[PDB]
Structure formats: C-alpha cells, structure tokens
Amino acid sequence: EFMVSLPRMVYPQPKVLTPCRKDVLVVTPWLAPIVWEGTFNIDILNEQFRLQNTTIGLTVFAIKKYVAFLKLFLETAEKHFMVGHRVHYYVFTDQPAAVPRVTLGTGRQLSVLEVRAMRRMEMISFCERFLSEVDYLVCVDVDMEFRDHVGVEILTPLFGTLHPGFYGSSREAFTYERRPQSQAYIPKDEGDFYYMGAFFGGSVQEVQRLTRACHQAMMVDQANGIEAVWHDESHLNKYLLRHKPTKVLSPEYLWDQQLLGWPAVLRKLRFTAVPKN
Amino acid sequence: EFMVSLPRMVYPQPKVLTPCRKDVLVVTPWLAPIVWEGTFNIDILNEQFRLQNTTIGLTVFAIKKYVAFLKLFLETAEKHFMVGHRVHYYVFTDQPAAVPRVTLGTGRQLSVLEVRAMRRMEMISFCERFLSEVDYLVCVDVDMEFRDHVGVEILTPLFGTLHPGFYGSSREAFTYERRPQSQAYIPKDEGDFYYMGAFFGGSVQEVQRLTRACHQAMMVDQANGIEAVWHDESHLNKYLLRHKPTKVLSPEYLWDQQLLGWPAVLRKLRFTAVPKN
Ligand SMILES: O=c1ccn([C@@H]2O[C@H](COP(=O)(O)OP(=O)(O)C[C@H]3O[C@H](CO)[C@H](O)[C@H](O)[C@H]3O)[C@@H](O)[C@H]2O)c(=O)[nH]1
Ligand SMILES: O=c1ccn([C@@H]2O[C@H](COP(=O)(O)OP(=O)(O)C[C@H]3O[C@H](CO)[C@H](O)[C@H](O)[C@H]3O)[C@@H](O)[C@H]2O)c(=O)[nH]1
Ligand SMILES: [Mn+2]
Ligand SMILES: [Mn+2]
C-alpha cells in the first residue's frame, strides 16, 4: 500500500484555464473521471502503477464457436493491453484444446480454465484464486480485438464502459430492463449512463461484489420466471446505478466501426468488435 | 468498508456530449478531479458519504494573536462546513481560555488542544487520536471564514488546493523553493500546480504520511541551515509533486477577495481570507 515517491519527470504543465477536452464530459457528477484520449498523461500513470507492481487479470469466455475469436483477441492484447505491466489472462472455455498457442511478452501468463458446455457472473464471483493472484480484474467479451492502447488509465476500484450505441442518448431511450417484476428494473426517470456488459472491471474485491450481486439478482429473476431484456448487461446497469463506478471508460474502449463508423469525438478506437453472427 | 446501495434518486441526466465546465480544467493528467462548482451533484455525494457514516476532522491552529480569528472561523464553519455530516474540530492553541464558546449543530464536537507558545506539520503527525476518531482530516488556516458550501465533494485519500494567486501562472513563475540545498527544491521544468499550505487534507493515513514527510524534510533543512522560501507550503508542494493528490480543489476553496476580486471563473467564493497583519 505505502506509495514511494515518483521520480523527477519532465512533461507539459497542466494549465488550469485550458481544458483537455471541451467537446465531451470528462468527469461524472459523482467526481469519477470519464476516460478519453487527451485527459491522461500515461507516463505519470505508468509510473504510479509500476511503483505498486500492479498485476492485472483479464477474464474472457470462449465457449462453443467463440473459441475462434481467441487468437486475434490474445495476439492483439499482447500488442496493446497493459504492456509493461504484469498480466494474467484467464480463458474460460469448454474446449481447452482449441485455445491457440499465443506467444506472450515477459511478465505475462495465461491460464486455461475449463467450464461446462448467468455463467460469466457466476464463474467470476462462486468459482474464481483472483484474490491471491491479481490486484485488478478486467472482464471483457472475446468477439473483439485491440487496435490501440488500453492501459492503467482504466484501473480504479470499480469501472464501467459507455455503450457505443447509446452515449449520446437520453435516459428514457436506454434499453434498461423496464419491468418492475425484474431485479434489474430501472424507471424511465433514473439512470446516469448505459454501460455495456462487454467491458467492466475494478479491484478484485469490487469486481467480486459486482458479479456476486448480479448473479444473485439473476437467480431471483430466474426463480420468478423472468429474464432481463439484455441479460447480464441489464443487471450490470442496475448495479452501477446503485453503486457508482469510480471511473467510466469512454466508447474509445468499446466500439464497433462497422456499425458506427469513426466519429470525430473518438480520437482513438482502442478495443473493437470483430464480425460474428 | 462494504457500501450499501444508493436509494432511488431523481436528478438531471449527465450528458456525455455536454461538459459541465468548458472554461476550466476539471481533471488532472493523473485522472484526479479538480473540484469546481458545476462538476458535482452534491445530493449524490452526500448520500454516498452518509451511507458510510463519515466523520471529518478539521484542524486549525490559533496561536498568539490569531485566537481572535476563531469566533468567525468556527461560527461560519457551522453554517457551511460538512453540514449534515459528523464533524470534530481540533483547535490547537496556546490560550485555551481564549477559545470562544461557539454553539455547534448536532453531531459536531470541538476539542481544545493546548500547545506551547514546523509546528503544524509536527503536531498533526508525532502528537495527534485521529485514527481512532475521524475518517478524514482537513487542515486549514484560521485567518479565514466560510461563505459558501464546503462539503464532502472535497473528500478523497489526498487533496491539495490551488493557490488563488497562481492558478493561471506558468510553472517557472511558481514560488517553489529553488535552492538545490533544500529538501523542498523543485527545478524550473517540474511542477503541476502551486498548492497553498492553508487547505489540504485526505484520509487520516494519507494526511499523517504527508505531515510526517514534510516534518522530516523540514528537520533536515534545519540541520543543514536552510529554511524554505515559503516554509511548510514549500514542503507541501514538494510532497504533492512526488505524491499526486487524488483530488485538487479549485480556488473557490481558498480565496482572497480583497486582493484578487471575484473573477468570472469562480461561481462561488467558499472559504476566504479575513484581514490580518
Ligand atoms: O456462444 C457463445 C456466446 C457468447 N459467448 C461469450 O459471451 C460474450 C457475449 O456474447 P456476444 O459477444 O455474442 O454478445 P454481444 O451482443 O456482444 C454482448 C451483449 O449481448 C449478450 C447476449 O447476446 C448479453 O446480453 C450481454 O450482456 C450484452 O453485453 C462473448 O463475447 C463470449 O465471451 C461465448 O463464449 N460463446
Ligand atoms: O502568530 C501566528 C501565526 C500563524 N498562525 C497559524 O498559522 C497559519 C498560517 O499563517 P498565516 O495565516 O499568517 O499565513 P498566510 O500567508 O495566510 C499562509 C502562508 O504563509 C505562512 C508564513 O507566514 C507559511 O509560509 C504557510 O505555509 C503559507 O501558506 C494561521 O492561519 C494560523 O493558523 C498562528 O496561529 N499564529
Ligand atoms: Mn460481444
Ligand atoms: Mn492564512
């Protein structure tokens, strides 16, 4: 925990009367940063997190046909995800033999965890070691590739990611679960953001809290014969409404260029959808 | 530590493509919020901190003639400082009998701590109970009055406050200690901000770390026959350069209207200088 001093660093002075970005909201109303290109000096952040010998776990599920996405996912993670930091990939699959042999950089390891042919929330919270092995957990979809830097700027006790389809939408248009019979229910007059289920994370403790809560809520819904409109994403949205994230990632971090192009407000496309279905 | 769910709340939706403030920097390059009016929803923050039964300690020194400032300081603190939260004032003085009898709101207490006729840094770190009694410490000058809200928006593990004289200045003009013989030395090409010694704080653990480090550095300087240009403020600046604060308060939180007026960029003057000397 004790944090040693940063070394001398030479970098541009932040200027108080000059915003980093004037086109987007860069802090939430509960004083959580919203992470966009131009808001962070990665050299400062890399120093801070390296001085703590930070280890990041990345969970990814590749079940049935989705094992086909692992090669590009992992090879591009090696180019772009937390480079220079300690990384432990946890690949959950029903086909351990189908996991591609991917060459890893130093300080990085991969574990194949076999699961049977609620699953993600249940598996992350009560199956999965994480408390002993990593400091932060990052939980992502596999049908994706990294194209640009995804680094320690995302790390914080709890984060969600703005869904690329809805970041400009008003809350009444968000596809929250709207049936009061569901544990994921959010009224039309509530909601901060629509977070996508495909990229969330935080400290191990906070991710375990989130995934446990979502799993429990999904079990209640199952017992009551209701399934939320967007499954675990609906529950994730309910949890993050009631437990505010300490950072929010911009849609740079979860994008679909085929569907949504490359808007001016995105200076980088960092982690992007690969064609499926 | 475990955080219960927030209740349902009705408030304006934050809009991603609408900044709260376009005239000022609202996040540092290490992703610490810079606290300005318009950046926070105090209802959300009050809920979050009340659900933790947060207790805030406020330290203030009133030695020799400065005991005269206590009445206005404390009476205005009662109107504006952390109202609704648990507050423990710690008044350090050489004249306990000169401390005014100030009426306090419920959930608020005051302790008079006698000291002899480095003192603040040494006293806060190794004399002073804080770990047992409060969650956060806020350390301020006494030659001041509260005019507007100062609340839980400031609370974070470690914060400093932008000096009202220098928030628009370039770093070469900052009055950092510039002699390499001083522990407080900062070269002309380093520095983020010029923080004022008159308002800093954080968790008890981080404030004890800061004050211990500054006290130790000041003792080294004394042993070497050098006194930093701005005394404890010079050391505070060195510490916060090397240990980045997790929030930075805007000059709303430390202002002198006689000297600097009321610029457009300040929507509120919250904690202001009273004439002295
Ligand atoms: O056969 C499979 C199916 C899924 N998966 C795993 O589940 C992840 C989500 O599914 P998908 O990407 O299709 O949904 P998207 O539309 O990108 C993601 C969204 O829709 C989901 C249902 O299809 C949920 O509602 C989720 O909460 C929401 O974010 C996928 O990346 C794999 O890691 C797998 O391993 N094998
Ligand atoms: O006789 C005294 C003298 C001081 N104090 C106490 O010290 C605080 C700082 O002093 P002051 O406000 O004069 O300095 P300012 O210019 O506002 C504050 C600045 O200058 C200081 C030296 O005068 C230091 O350099 C400090 O670090 C810097 O911020 C004052 O508010 C009292 O709580 C006291 O109790 N009795
Ligand atoms: Mn997907
Ligand atoms: Mn003062």
Curated annotation (Swiss-Prot), chains A, B:
Effect of P164A: In allele B(A)
Pathway: Protein modification; protein glycosylation
Chemical reaction(s) catalysed: an alpha-L-fucosyl-(1->2)-beta-D-galactosyl derivative + UDP-N-acetyl-alpha-D-galactosamine = an N-acetyl-alpha-D-galactosaminyl-(1->3)-[alpha-L-fucosyl-(1->2)]-beta-D-galactosyl derivative + UDP + H(+); an alpha-L-fucosyl-(1->2)-beta-D-galactosyl derivative + UDP-alpha-D-galactose = an alpha-D-galactosyl-(1->3)-[alpha-L-fucosyl-(1->2)]-beta-D-galactosyl derivative + UDP + H(+)
Keyword Disulfide bond among UniProt keywords: no
Positions of glycan attachment: N53
E.C. number(s) listed in UniProt: 2.4.1.40, 2.4.1.37
Free-text cofactor note: Binds 1 Mn(2+) ion per subunit.
Sequence positions that bind Mn(2+): D141, D143
Residues the record lists as binding an alpha-L-fucosyl-(1->2)-beta-D-galactosyl derivative: H163, T175, E233, D256
This protein's record includes keyword rRNA-binding: no
Post-translational modification: The soluble form derives from the membrane form by proteolytic processing.
Biological process according to GO: carbohydrate metabolic process; lipid glycosylation; protein glycosylation
Membrane topology type: Single-pass type II membrane protein
Enzyme class: transferase
An example Gene Ontology molecular-function term: antigen binding
Mutagenesis or variant effect for M144R: In allele Bel01; loss of manganese binding and reduced catalytic activity
Cofactor(s) listed in the protein's UniProt record: Mn(2+)
GO cellular component: extracellular region; Golgi apparatus; Golgi cisterna membrane; Golgi membrane; vesicle
Entry similarity comment: Belongs to the glycosyltransferase 6 family.
Its job: This protein is the basis of the ABO blood group system. The histo-blood group ABO involves three carbohydrate antigens: A, B, and H. A, B, and AB individuals express a glycosyltransferase activity that converts the H antigen to the A antigen (by addition of UDP-GalNAc) or to the B antigen (by addition of UDP-Gal), whereas O individuals lack such activity.
Domain observations: The conserved DXD motif is involved in cofactor binding. The manganese ion interacts with the beta-phosphate group of UDP and may also have a role in catalysis.
Stated name of the protein: Histo-blood group ABO system transferase
Full protein segment contained here: 64 to 347 of 354
